[PDB]
């Protein structure tokens, strides 16, 4: 950890905190919500120990990276713009990509726009968002799950931030990180309440230390949740803007890994899409789908060694 190098770089007009370690082919790690570069700490160490250059930035709006004020600065194109600039800086033509949650949606965009830049992709938890020309991303979620589905509840500017503020930052982060409840997260009306987890434990599960939680908390207490929430607020706009790639296929090699209890895996008809043929139809070189038994949403932290090995074995074929 003390050997991990932290720097601030200038990419696509913003200032981005980059954590990195090791030399070799770059493995670029993209965190999601409500995560940080820190979420990748086990993968950064392991992969850098095996002759790979591990790079994990805080994404726009997160952690120690610049957080633009306008909701409009958080389209997928803005984030991919950041990352193309970062990769150009690292000095490489291609990278290996590993990603989780929002990081994975951004990762899919990168593979859509610049497949030539991604050798292979280890995708955690979030499969490709299939673009249905007949219905917008969030319209489809609201039709399926109603207005209290978390992504719908994240849409209205300021509202979720205020609801989170009432319960406090530490509660929100513990609530989400500790959850093991499968299925669509549906919030109680009018408030955060029990949010993602109606069964919060007194003690943190053994994969998360008091210090780990404190690191997340210290960053989020500074930045708030607005930048991260702004990604979700651009989902319908991403759907409009990604129209040029309608009915396209992704030819990058992909290894998809998810926990059995992951809420994404157990919602939005994702199991059908993943195993039923669609995912492979969109992603011809989807190789192995791995479902980790008794592991939930934060699988790279909860099952860190397993993840490390799957990443390595996969990327080494190349």
- How many C-beta atoms surround the C-beta of residue 288 within 10 A? 11
Q: Are 131 and 109 in contact (CB under 8 A)?
A: no
Q: What is the number of other CB atoms lying within 10 angstroms of the CB of residue 248?
A: 11
Look up 232 and say whether it is catalytic. Answer: yes
| Backbone region of residue 268 per phi and psi (left: phi > 0; alpha: psi in -120 to 50; beta: other values) | left
CB atoms closer than 10 angstroms to residue 167: 15
Query: Are 160 and 229 in contact, with CB atoms under 8 Å apart?
Result: yes
C-alpha distances in Å from residue 148, one per residue of 142, 160, 162, 189, 195: 8, 11, 16, 7, 10
Helix (H) or strand (E) holding 98: strand 95-100
For residue 29, the cross-strand partners are 98
Check residue 287 and report its DSSP letter.
E
Residues written for the chain: 318
Bridge partners, 100 (sequence order): 124
State this model's resolution in angstroms.
1.9
Exposure class string for 71-85: b at 16+ Cβ within 10 A, else e: bebbbbebbbbbbbb
Contacts (Cβ under 8 Å, ≥6 apart) of 215: 36, 38
Contact 240, 75 (CB under 8 A): no
Tokens 């949650």 correspond to what residue?
101
Residue 19 and residue 88: Cα distance in Å, rounded?
Answer: 16
The single residue of 17, 31, 100, 297 carrying the catalytic annotation is: 297
Say which CATH superfamily domain 1-318 falls into. Alpha/Beta hydrolase fold, catalytic domain (3.40.50.1820)
Phi-psi region of 66 (alpha: psi -120 to 50; beta: other; left: phi over 0): beta
Experimental method: X-ray
What CA–CA distance (Å, rounded) separates 26 from 16? Answer: 18
17 phi, psi to nearest 5 deg? -70, 125
Supply 143's token pair: 């039709």
β-bridge mates for residue 290, sequence order: 257
CA separation for the pair 252, 97 (Å, rounded) = 10
Q: What is d(CA 248, CA 203) in angstroms, rounded to the nearest whole number?
A: 46
Pick the catalytic residue: 109, 149, 232, 265?
232
What is the b/e burial string over 177-213, where b = at least 16 CB atoms within 10 angstroms of the residue's CB? bbbbbbebbbbeeeebeebbbeeeeeeeeebbeeebb
β-bridge partners, 5? 20
User: Is residue 35 a contact partner of residue 231, using CB atoms and an 8 Å limit?
Assistant: no
Exposed e or buried b for every residue in 118-150, given b needs 16+ CB within 10 A? Answer: bbbbbbbbbbbbebeeeebbbebbbeebeeebb
The residue from 58, 82, 101, 262 that is catalytic is 101
* Token digits of residue 54: 């591990």
Structural tokens at position 306: 């397993």
For residue 223, CA distances in Å to 32, 58, 120, 134, 206 come to: 15, 12, 32, 37, 27
3-state secondary structure of 208: coil
Active site residue 101: yes
Give the ranges where the chain is alpha helix by DSSP (H): 41-48, 76-90, 102-113, 137-145, 150-153, 159-167, 169-177, 210-223, 226-232, 235-241, 270-276, 278-282, 299-302, 304-316
Residue ranges of domains in the chain? 1-318
Q: Is 148 a catalytic residue?
A: no
Sheet holding 95-100, edge to edge: 5-11, 14-21, 53-57, 26-30, 95-100, 118-124, 254-259, 286-292
Q: At what angle do helices 102-113 and 76-90 cross, to 10 degrees?
A: 70
Q: 3-class DSSP state for residue 44? A: helix
Structure tokens that stand for 133 in this block: 């020309």
Rounded Cα distance between 25 and 29, Å, is 13
Are 47 and 22 within 8 A, CB to CB?
yes
């Amino acid at each position: 950890m003390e050997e991990i190098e932290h720097r601030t770089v200038e990419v696509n007009g913003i200032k981005m905190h980059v954590a990195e370690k090791g030399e070799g082919p770059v493995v670029l790690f993209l965190h999601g919500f409500p995560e940080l570069w820190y979420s990748w700490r086990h993968q950064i160490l392991a992969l850098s120990s095996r002759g790979y250059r591990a790079v994990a930035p805080d994404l726009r709006g997160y952690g120690d990276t610049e957080a633009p004020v306008s909701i409009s600065s958080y389209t997928g194109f803005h984030i991919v713009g950041d990352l193309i600039a970062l990769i150009d800086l690292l000095g490489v033509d291609q990278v290996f990509l590993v990603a989780h949650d929002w990081g994975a949606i951004i990762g899919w965009y990168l593979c859509t726009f610049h497949p030539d830049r991604v050798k292979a992709y280890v995708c955690l938890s979030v499969p490709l968002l299939h673009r249905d020309p007949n219905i917008r991303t969030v319209d489809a979620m609201r039709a399926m799950y109603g207005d209290d589905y978390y992504i719908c509840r994240f849409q209205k500017p300021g509202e979720m931030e205020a609801q989170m503020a009432e319960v406090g930052t530490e509660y929100v982060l513990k609530n989400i990180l500790t959850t093991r409840k499968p299925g669509p997260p549906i919030f109680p009306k009018g408030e955060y309440g029990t949010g993602f987890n109606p069964d919060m434990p007194n003690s943190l599960p053994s994969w998360l230390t008091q210090d780990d939680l404190a690191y997340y908390v210290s960053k989020y207490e500074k930045t708030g949740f607005t930048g991260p929430l702004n990604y979700y607020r651009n989902m319908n706009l991403n759907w409009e803007l990604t129209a040029p790639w309608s009915g396209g296929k992704i030819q990058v090699p992909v290894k998809f890994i998810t926990g059995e209890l992951d809420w994404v895996y157990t919602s939005l008809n994702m199991k059908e899409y993943i195993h039923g043929g669609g995912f492979k139809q969109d992603v011809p070189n989807l190789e192995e789908v791995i479902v980790q038994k008794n592991v939930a949403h934060f699988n790279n932290q909860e099952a860190a060694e397993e993840i490390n090995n799957h990443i390595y074995d996969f990327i080494k074929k190349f």
